[PDB]
Amino acid sequence: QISVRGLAGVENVTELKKNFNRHLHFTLVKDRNVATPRDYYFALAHTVRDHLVGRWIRTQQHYYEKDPKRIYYLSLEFYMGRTLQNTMVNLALENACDEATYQLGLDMEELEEIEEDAGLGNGGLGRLAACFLDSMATLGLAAYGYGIRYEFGIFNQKICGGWQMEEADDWLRYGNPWEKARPEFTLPVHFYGRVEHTSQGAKWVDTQVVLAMPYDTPVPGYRNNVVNTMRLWSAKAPNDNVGGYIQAVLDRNLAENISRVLYPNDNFFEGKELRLKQEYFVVAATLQDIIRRFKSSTNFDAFPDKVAIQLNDTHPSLAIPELMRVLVDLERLDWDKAWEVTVKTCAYTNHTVLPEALERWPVHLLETLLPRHLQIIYEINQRFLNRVAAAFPGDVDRLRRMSLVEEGAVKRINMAHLCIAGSHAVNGVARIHSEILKKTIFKDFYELEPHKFQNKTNGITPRRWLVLCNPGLAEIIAERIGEEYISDLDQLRKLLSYVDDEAFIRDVAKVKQENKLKFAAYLEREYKVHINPNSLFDVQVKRIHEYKRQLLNCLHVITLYNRIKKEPNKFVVPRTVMIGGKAAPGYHMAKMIIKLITAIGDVVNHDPVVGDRLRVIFLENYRVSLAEKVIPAADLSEQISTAGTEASGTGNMKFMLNGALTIGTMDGANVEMAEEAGEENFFIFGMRVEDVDRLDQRGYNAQEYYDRIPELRQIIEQLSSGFFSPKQPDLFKDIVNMLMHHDRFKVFADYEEYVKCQERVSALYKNPREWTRMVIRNIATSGKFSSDRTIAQYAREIWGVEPSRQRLPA
């Protein structure tokens, strides 16, 4: 049908059909008479998987022969989504599979909807790991993703009576055709025990053993025949009265609970023992793999020349003392040499400045679980503080501020301080964020070691986030400038010479309309909700947090409703306001915000005077596969976090690539997005970082805003009095109290400018031609935000390896 989806050659189509029928028969053990759509999905999945295998085997044998420097990306989260379409796109098989399935009387799009998301992440940090894997394979790097194979990923979100309900994400129920179990490569991981000192040094003894069993998933590069590996570890118990015998077998569950479930708290660090076991589990098994592969190339001097370890946040920070443990205790290297190797091997990426989200492990947990690692950490700390003392003599408060050990009621280890000390590079994820790190929370460390601190602005993969989810747009771009932009997104700048092209303007607006019609039909078929496709699609999708200010969006929505009720016969630009995202199970305020959104919808969606001029919809179960649908349909992207709080954002970049305009604060990557497109082509409002700081010095008083803004007062009175909850009048008292007395994120302070800026958005939407010309200006300058650019920067500036677009032989 469309050119970017590849060739549908006579021979390839014939061969795909027969392999499909073979898998249906031999693999699934079904006949065409009883086969269901799920059976057909699996036969297709297995057929496509076959095409990966040859390339997967030859890629890995190529690395064994050439022995390049290996990149190990360690993360507790890989938010992968679906694999089938991504694999087809990267193998240039999409049109051929489309034709093959059509000739067998099937709709491939229907089959695609059957695949479960691999929801092994919470949000931006987890999705970043996934985009990074895609770009690393596309750039020909010898890269491995290492993590945990959770049996249960992020919970499925149901909305009952306006409230979030959580249910288990049993994503492995029907099996995973993409993974290959490697039980032969199982490795032991040690817990608890005690430290024994001998003539020869320290020994970690009397431990409990848990086995780590690897599962390998292929990661295909974009049309370069490169297939890398994501290796995820699964926890297994070792094999060593009737009631007693039975109970001993049932108690094996205790060991295997390690890999059972992803922790869904992305707002607040919790010092839970099971989470600590998960973190050590991934780290210990991974490092054994790394060392084995290194030894099969004695001389650890060359270790940093052959190995790079990237820590995705502090979650795998135990890699630092674990590498020291192995090098000192097992390989018998002297402390100083082991330390030199460790520092040159590891690099650390920070994703937030919010103190409640930073890992600080109680010393007593580490003492019990990992007694040797605690000894190593104390020793790291002493040697590090000796360096600080020598550089800043007499500065006693610097010593207590920079310590890896935090004093107080409970002693804690600061994992961020450990990461900076043990890494040769530390990066933030957007320019403004990396600057904030140097000026505020890591200032002392930057003064000691300025060379360590870098920026690496985040990116997204244009394969999943354009070609896959928005083929219509990918195709009209390809018509003008060809197909090379898919792996070189900077080429999109060539679209600027089409900003006054009447044909192109019409086509861009046509693609958006088609996307909006398709998504409008999705909402009716799967959720039974009616929307006007001619309205402006106003979309905020992301995890529910106070800092992301879904509440500010809520206040605007209520303002629009109140204005309509006041002047019903006045014209307003029609809007569909869509808000979606999951709240962490323990986050009471985030759960209240979801209830508020649905409550507003209940009032607004059923007011006859409003009509089809305003609709408020909460998008249920937001996840990667839902993002692929809603983002191409969006007109307006809401990126409205308090300045200084969102490290980067990546959702912002997805919307920019797909033809939405952005309303946002000067926060995270928004700053660089506005810089690339031009401030005149963005809807920027609100306090800058400097304004927030000024307000903090003075003291933020929300009452001031309530007193001086009549429209804001009305909303607060409506919330308090029970306008949005007639049967439970005080339902939203917690929200009002927080806004009025304890708002860390200054919602009221940005309200006026936000509302005014929203009026400017509506004004431009009234002029379709100029809206679309601004859109073209955005798409055309979104090239910087490809993860290929991001990964090339990591490779050159951190890992010390050169990227390559050279094809491997088929």
Add this chain to the structure above:
Amino acid sequence: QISVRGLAGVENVTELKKNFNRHLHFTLVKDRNVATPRDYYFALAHTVRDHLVGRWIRTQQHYYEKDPKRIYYLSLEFYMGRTLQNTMVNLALENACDEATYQLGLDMEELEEIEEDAGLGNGGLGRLAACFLDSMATLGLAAYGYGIRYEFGIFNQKICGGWQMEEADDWLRYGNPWEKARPEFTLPVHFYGRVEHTSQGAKWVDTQVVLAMPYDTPVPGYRNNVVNTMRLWSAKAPNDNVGGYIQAVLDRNLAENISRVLYPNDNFFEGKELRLKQEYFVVAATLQDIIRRFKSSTNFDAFPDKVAIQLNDTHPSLAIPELMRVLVDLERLDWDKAWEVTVKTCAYTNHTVLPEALERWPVHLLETLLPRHLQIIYEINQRFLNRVAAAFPGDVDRLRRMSLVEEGAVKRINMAHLCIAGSHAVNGVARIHSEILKKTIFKDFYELEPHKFQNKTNGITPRRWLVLCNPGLAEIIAERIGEEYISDLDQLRKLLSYVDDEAFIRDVAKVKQENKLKFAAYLEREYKVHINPNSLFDVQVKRIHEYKRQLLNCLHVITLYNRIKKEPNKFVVPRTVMIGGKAAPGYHMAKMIIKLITAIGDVVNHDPVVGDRLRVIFLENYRVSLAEKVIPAADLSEQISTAGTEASGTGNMKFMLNGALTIGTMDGANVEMAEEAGEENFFIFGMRVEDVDRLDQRGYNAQEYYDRIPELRQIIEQLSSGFFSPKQPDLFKDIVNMLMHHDRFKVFADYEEYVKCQERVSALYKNPREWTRMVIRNIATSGKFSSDRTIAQYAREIWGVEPSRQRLPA
């Protein structure tokens, strides 16, 4: 190489090799450079599995079209062993696969040793189910085996310091290529709750739900293109604060524990709740399948014409009140009609008369777990006792004896009484056993309903237990009489005309020698123990129980040793005494017996005066795959249970088919074996059932035997004084105490006749030609003990269906 293993045609060999290489590449994702023997096993397994699929699909569609009466064999145990060689044998593929693997430079026998046993049973009852599945497929019956997919089967037995140690049988670790998960056919099972009475009848409400997920395994008939199904259920939890959320996900283990592990107690019934859940779980899911399949053929009058349910012991006895529950509560049939259907549908097989092994469930367990089923049982009991009262008016003690409810400290339900009441047929498993049922424990029931009581003498499959494990013997038989005996074992009688054939005599003895050499080499390679292959192989293999009298064997062994020590320079027939078997984890006395056997070995095997004239070996980890090795190597089969205690035995039949002579009591199937071969061709000794009864009336006094038999006194003194345990002199005090004061099985009473009979064995072994002629007389008359005969009897006399040797098209 040999004819019974099929053709190795040019085209078939070529096709097997390429499919092997395809699976290695696409299925296992390996290259020839890193592949291990395990990889090669899996590629072969997958290649052979492909040949089953077409036949499996066409067999099951054939049943849907023709709609024959369906046989459902319900068992908590299926002791399957290995599947690869069995499948090759039944598909006539063994020589072709042998050639194909040889040409790829591999040894197929080495690959076969890699497969794990499916050890989903304890012993004879579990192995009977497996043999039965094989015969049902071979006889073309529309049969289904239904059970539980245990994650952990019977424990692996290790011997440490002479003591049994148990370790988890993690048989699924590397995956099971034979099974196909059917997550789409998952069914709900209900537990706990309460009973509500409505105008419309009873309702079972407020239940906890556990999901039953089926796994299907193919069961191929012998060269008839029939492939039946064994369906095993796996337990799954349904999908519906951070600490709380995490804990709720981890608590899913509670539901899934149902299918975690096989209960290894085969000696003593234990009323454990988890075992009860297992029993209901298999029954409830199976009956839903049965009914669905029946409805997809409204009129339950025809139910017994289309369905037979066979209960393997009382373990699935809950099928009776569950069928009533469904028919009365859900389908709204009147009680009397539902009862008529149930009785005509179900049949019950008993496997023991020992009262401690009979299931008697505490009423309070059933009340909590299955409140509706208890109501139904009480109602069954009342109506049944009304019938007894009418038939035997005024006989009040008969009423209390026949009741399904047993009175006492704790009220219990007698599951055997439930089974007899709700079944149209009840059978024992050997003629003497079925007679004992009618005369003793079920006498009252036989007086009420004589027509219900039958015999069905057990059998073994000649495929696994001759062709597979003893190809050498199968081939020399085939040379004389052809290949038809494999599915018509009665044809072995034709071998009687070769009893004076000098060529045949030499060949039979040659096959045995080769088997003994092969097994002697197995013991050195895998266990590092030295044996003389010229010695008489004296073998007792079976689960360790007091009734099976491994202790009597022990007393003989010690007698031989003492006699040698007394007259060292006298000639004795050299013997290797092999004893093997697992003890139930809580069975202290059985564990002591294992320790005794190893302790005797420690003394006997290291006595210089003994030399190679006597060796005592405990065979570790006895299981189906070990039976396939040791049985073909045996000269003497020990079947020495106290008369009236072993219901049938099946190991006895395996030894007879494979060229061992039998020393045994007139117990179980031994009686019929002796009848078939002629008593002159068996070594029969000891008390008959009548003699045991006489002794019980008088009172068994072990001291009498101790006083009057000097050789027995010496052994008891040796045991007591610490001859076999110098560092722990009183180690065996429990054994001595039991033998002297509390021996239920009268070990001393059979000692003299046993020892004398053993001398007669040794005398005949001195004459190789006459030994072999007696062996030929045994093999030639073992035809009755084929499970094809057994299953044809069930089919004709219980299930009401005709067997068929007609081939299905390929």
